[PDB]
């Protein structure tokens, strides 16, 4: 070749990923209808194996084999931005459901929001702490980024460890909130909008945290150069996305919706 693009070795992971999607969906069906978790656990296992080996291979291709020229890296930047945009529009649908229900509360609710019989969480207690935690994690991940660019291994690792710690703290606080909440997913459209929107956000916090942990271990193994660290940049962009979605949830569901 006399172009700078990456001709990828033939790979089984697209097919294993597609089959993992079949097993997870047929598995959810078999859990919801036929009282059985077997297909679902095979699908979750094969999905995790597929993601592990696929992203391992991307590290092999880039850090170990040198395939990520500037042109390839520019492609991956566009890819991650477009992926984040798709995730924003997914959340938009849940915000639309929330505002539809809350702005025009039906007679069944008592014609009010929150509905009769719903006792919302105090937004000034754990939800405010959760806000301070994710905002703080946006500051620490920016410190990590600058440490890496400046060639500082020790301070990149300390800043990234602090970011992950705050992500875990948010997750344990939210798990505690979930358990303590006097309303449930079955508490009409209030519970529905609350748990599905914050639940998908909590999933994205766990995903984002897992991505940062992958970056932590790659940094421990000296994979990143001071100039070339797109996995770190992508994890940072994703993490900022998770923060911003939280700020919109906090203002919309916890504060305005109380």
């Amino acid at each position: 070749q006399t172009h700078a693009y990456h001709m990828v070795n033939p790979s089984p992971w697209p097919l294993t990923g597609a089959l993992s999607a079949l097993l997870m969906t047929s598995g959810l069906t078999m859990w919801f209808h036929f009282n059985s978790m077997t297909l679902l656990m095979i699908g979750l296992t094969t999905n995790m194996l597929t993601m592990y080996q696929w992203w391992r291979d991307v590290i092999r291709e880039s850090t170990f084999q040198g395939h990520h020229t500037p042109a390839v890296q520019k492609g991956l930047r566009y890819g991650m931005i477009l992926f984040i945009i798709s995730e924003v529009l997914f959340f938009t649908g849940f915000f639309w459901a929330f505002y539809h229900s809350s702005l025009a509360p039906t007679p069944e609710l008592g014609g009010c929001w929150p509905p009769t019989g719903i006792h919302p969480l105090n937004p000034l207690e754990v939800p405010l702490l959760n806000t301070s935690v994710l905002l703080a994690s946006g500051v620490s991940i920016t410190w990590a980024h600058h440490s890496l660019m400046e060639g500082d291994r020790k301070h990149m690792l300390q800043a990234l460890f602090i970011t992950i710690t705050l992500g875990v703290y948010f997750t344990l606080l939210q798990a505690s909130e979930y358990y303590e909440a006097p309303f449930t997913i079955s508490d009409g459209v209030y519970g529905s909008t609350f748990f599905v929107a914050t639940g998908f956000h909590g999933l994205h916090v766990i995903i984002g945290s897992t991505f940062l942990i992958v970056c932590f271990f790659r940094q421990l193994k000296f994979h990143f150069t001071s100039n070339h660290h797109f996995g770190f940049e992508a994890a940072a962009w994703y993490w900022h996305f998770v923060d911003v979605v939280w700020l919109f949830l906090y203002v919309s569901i916890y504060w305005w919706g109380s």
Binding site: P10, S11, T16, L23, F34, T38, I42, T63, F64, Q65
Partner: protein, 56 residues
Amino acid sequence: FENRVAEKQKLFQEDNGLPVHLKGGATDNILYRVTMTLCLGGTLYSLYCLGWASFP
């Protein structure tokens, strides 16, 4: 820890004709065989489940 990236560059650039998913050695083969066996077996199981669920 020590920077061992040069040693991994040498392993993954060896002229042995292996595709990148198998180039780490025997462990890659084992993990690939586990993954593909679970996917194909799982898929066969999902078809049996379809057969079962298609009748009262």
